[PDB]
Each structure stands twice: as structure tokens, then as C-alpha cells.
């Protein structure tokens, strides 16, 4: 699959994947679906911040998956740190796309001179933690019952990857 920046024409495909995640998974901790205007606003905001929105596709040109990153925390002191999110279309799982999209984000982040990429993972997702681990992430936080979905408390696991370890200062 090819990976590249998203265009406005990829937004309805992205919308479908997203609304789908929020109502049937613990991958996204929102329960309310959004509309196209909402994603168009998100698309423009990422553009002003210089943050990428990547799309996995092929010859057919359909959105098989997407990924992006943005502010981890809203303060000037965290500008060297970003948090990512990756989503694969449901008929496309088990094909290694998630790893492809995450690796692409890491390359864009590194190229932009960012220092750390953070991952927030539902603690029960052992496979997701294992995949992030193989890519260089290390667990830096384990926070009990800070979230909730489908009527139950959720635990969050924080993982991080230092994009440039030899950089003694910003």
C-alpha cells in the first residue's frame, strides 16, 4: 500500500472509518459520531499546525487506513512532543497496515525536528502495546480507571519514543 498526505477528496473515506471506530471499539474514547464538516475543520487545523494526516491506499484509490499526530498537551512547553492515532478500515485488518502508517508518521515527525512521540493505549490491548514496543516505544505510564466506555472504567497505558536521543537540549 502507498502512504501519502490526505487530500480533501479522502475525507469521506476517513469519516467512515472514524465514526466506525467510536461506536464499536475502545481504540477511540469518544462515543459521538461526527459529520464531514467536522473532519474538514480538523483537516484545515492540522494544515495550519504543519501536522500531517496520512492515508494508506492502492491502485483503486480508496482509503484503507489513515493516521495523524497533533499536540500532546496544549502549552508552549510541550512543543517538542506530539501524540499520534492510527485507524485501519475494518475489512483491511491483519495486513500490517497499522505498522506501515505508524512508521510513516515517525519519519515525518523526525524530519520536522520533533523530540518525542507519545502513544495512549487502552491497557487491555496487548497486541497494540507489543507492536509499539517492537517499533522502539517504551512504557512510561500506567494510569488506572482514568477513562470509560460502554459503561465501564478503562485503564490507559502511555508509551513514548525519543526521536533524537543525542540531542542534549532543544
Swiss-Prot record:
Enzyme class (EC, first level): transferase
InterPro entries in the record: Acyl_CoA_acyltransferase, GNAT_dom
Catalyzed reactions per annotation: L-methionine sulfoximine + acetyl-CoA = N-acetyl-L-methionine sulfoximine + CoA + H(+); L-methionine sulfone + acetyl-CoA = N-acetyl-L-methionine sulfone + CoA + H(+)
SUPFAM superfamilies linked: Acyl-CoA N-acyltransferases (Nat) (SSF55729)
Binding site residues for acetyl-CoA: 86-88, 94-99, 125
GO function terms (MF aspect): acyltransferase activity, transferring groups other than amino-acyl groups
Residues annotated as domain N-acetyltransferase: 1-164
Residues that, per the record, bind substrate: 73-75, 83-85
E.C. numbers: 2.3.1.-
Pfam families registered for this protein in UniProt: Acetyltransf_1
Keyword Signal set for record: no
SUBUNIT field: Homodimer.
Function in brief: Plays a role in the resistance against the toxic effects of L-methionine sulfoximine (MSX), a rare amino acid, which inhibits glutamine synthetase (GlnA). Catalyzes the acetylation of L-methionine sulfoximine (MSX).
Protein name from the UniProt record: L-methionine sulfoximine/L-methionine sulfone acetyltransferase
Organism the protein comes from: Pseudomonas aeruginosa (strain ATCC 15692 / DSM 22644 / CIP 104116 / JCM 14847 / LMG 12228 / 1C / PRS 101 / PAO1)
Amino acid at each position: 500500500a502507498s502512504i501519502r498526505d490526505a487530500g480533501v477528496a479522502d475525507l469521506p473515506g476517513i469519516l467512515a472509518i472514524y465514526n466506525d471506530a467510536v461506536g464499536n471499539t475502545t481504540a477511540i474514547w469518544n462515543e459521538t459520531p461526527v459529520d464531514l464538516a467536522n473532519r474538514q475543520a480538523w483537516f484545515d487545523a492540522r494544515a495550519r499546525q504543519g501536522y500531517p494526516i496520512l492515508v494508506a491506499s492502492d491502485a483503486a484509490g480508496e482509503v484503507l487506513g489513515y493516521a495523524s499526530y497533533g499536540d500532546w498537551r496544549p502549552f508552549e512547553g510541550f512543543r517538542g512532543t506530539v501524540e499520534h492515532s492510527v485507524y485501519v478500515r475494518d475489512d483491511q485488518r491483519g495486513k500490517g497496515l497499522g505498522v506501515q502508517l505508524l512508521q510513516a508518521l515517525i519519519e515525518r515527525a523526525r524530519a520536522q525536528g520533533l523530540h518525542v512521540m507519545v502513544a495512549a493505549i487502552e491497557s487491555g490491548n496487548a497486541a497494540s502495546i507489543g507492536l509499539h514496543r517492537r517499533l522502539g516505544f517504551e512504557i512510561s505510564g500506567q494510569m488506572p480507571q482514568v477513562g470509560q466506555k460502554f459503561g465501564r472504567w478503562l485503564d490507559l497505558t502511555f508509551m513514548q519514543l525519543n526521536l533524537d536521543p543525542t540531542r542534549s537540549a532543544p
